[PDB]
Amino acid sequence: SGMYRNFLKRVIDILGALFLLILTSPIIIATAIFIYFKVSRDVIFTQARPGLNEKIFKIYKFKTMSDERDANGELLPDDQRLGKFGKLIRSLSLDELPQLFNVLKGDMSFIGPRPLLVEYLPIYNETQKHRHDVRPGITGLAQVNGRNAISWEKKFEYDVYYAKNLSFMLDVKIALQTIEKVLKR
């Protein structure tokens, strides 16, 4: 290919992220306000993950757990630092919204491999390393093919096949498989 792989896919990523950022902007400001006054005035925390050509970038996400400490300082267990409304924000995936800015700025695509830990970079073999030949995605070929089994090698098989055979057909197929995925629980 080339015409869609090297150009048109990025435009849909930019416009889509820009449209969705303006579309959910009241919810974004509302979420940040609640977190500011009841969780943490830092609101946003970043996540360093490998991306295109394995280059590290920070993933933006809303902070949901408090920054509470202990009499000795070792933080409370995760049970007591995550209130009911924090779980509600997590449940509605509102904390995930800042990643639209990641998609907009080029860190990620709308459809692509899942951003995983930096630890796995030396573990990937010569075939699985190719999953970083494309930008990571909010959804992708591996996310829609979940079969209640943790076969990392088969997830990586889907990842490598996607990076090699990126098509406008395939992207539409993933998009339909993603909305049909959410029609179920």
Residue numbers in the entry: -1 to 183
Paper quotes:
In the current study, further insight is derived from the structure of selenomethionine (SeMet)-derivatized PglC co-crystallized with UDP. UDP was utilized in co-crystallization, as it significantly stabilized this PGT as shown by nanoscale differential scanning fluorimetry (nanoDSF). In contrast to I57M/Q175M PglC, the SeMet PglC has an asymmetric unit (ASU) comprising eight monomers rather than two per unit cell, allowing independent refinement. Although the resolution was low (3.01 Å), and the ligand was not stoichiometrically bound (10–20% occupancy of any ligand to the active site), it was possible to make correlations between the presence or absence of electron density and the loop conformations. When the eight copies of PglC in the ASU were overlaid, the mobile loop is the main region of structural divergence between the chains. In monomers G and H, which are closed, as well as A and B (intermediate conformation), a comparatively large number of electrons is present in the site where the nucleotide would be expected to bind. In contrast, monomers C, D, E, and F, which are open, all have significantly fewer electrons present. Analysis of the mobile loop in the context of active-site ligand occupancy shows that chains with a greater positive electron density were in a more closed conformation than those with little or no density. Monomers occupying the same position within each of the four lattice dimers do not always occupy the same mobile loop position; thus, the difference in the observed loop conformation is likely due to differential binding at the active site.
